[PDB]
Amino acid sequence: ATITDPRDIILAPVISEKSYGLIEDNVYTFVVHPDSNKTQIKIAIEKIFDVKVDSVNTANRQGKRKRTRTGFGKRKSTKRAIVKLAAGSKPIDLFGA
């Protein structure tokens, strides 16, 4: 069988100045599965943090082509999901900001 936990889509959070500022604005950015979609992510986030999500915005980020003696090498093309919770939304603690 397969268990479609919503936590398989949500891979990791993003830790950056921009992510922290958006956290102050109550907007949390995650690294999601590249084959996911906004509605899937909304449902997953809701089921995970027991919260209500206003919008979800996705940006696909190509991988950096880094060089080496062998030649060149490319990192992974990630997918970021920026998630605006609703007004109150009982915010998240798991980011360790």
Binding site: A1, D5, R7, I10, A12, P13, I15, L94, F95, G96
Partner: protein
């Protein structure tokens, strides 16, 4: 962490519950690692192995 010997005692529903719990632990651990709040990095491999064992057991019960 847990053994197949002691996973085969459990039921399908207990296994699925343990699977959900292990996926939750893995989620929390990925977040801890991203934030730097994880010393024990091997918990991730451990939990992935637990998930694999559980899926293996369930498929084994499905087939024979």
């Amino acid at each position: 962490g847990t053994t197949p010997g002691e996973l085969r005692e459990l039921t399908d529903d207990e296994l699925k519950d343990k699977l959900r719990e292990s996926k939750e632990e893995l989620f929390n651990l990925r977040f801890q690692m991203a934030t730097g709040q994880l010393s024990n990095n091997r918990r991730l491999r451990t939990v992935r192995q637990e998930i694999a064992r559980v899926y293996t057991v369930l498929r084994e019960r499905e087939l024979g």
